Amino acid sequence: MISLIAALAVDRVIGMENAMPWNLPADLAWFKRNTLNKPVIMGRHTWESIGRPLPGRKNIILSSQPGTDDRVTWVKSVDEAIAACGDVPEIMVIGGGRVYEQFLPKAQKLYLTHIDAEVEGDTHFPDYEPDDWESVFSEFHDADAQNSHSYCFEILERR
Ligand SMILES: NC(=O)c1ccc[n+]([C@@H]2O[C@H](COP(=O)([O-])OP(=O)(O)OC[C@H]3O[C@@H](n4cnc5c(N)ncnc54)[C@H](OP(=O)(O)O)[C@@H]3O)[C@@H](O)[C@H]2O)c1
Ligand SMILES: Nc1nc(=O)c2nc(CNc3ccc(C(=O)N[C@@H](CCC(=O)O)C(=O)O)cc3)cnc2[nH]1
Ligand SMILES: [Mn+2]
Ligand SMILES: [Mn+2]
Question: Closest ligand 1 atom to the C-alpha of 20?
Answer without folding.
Answer: 47
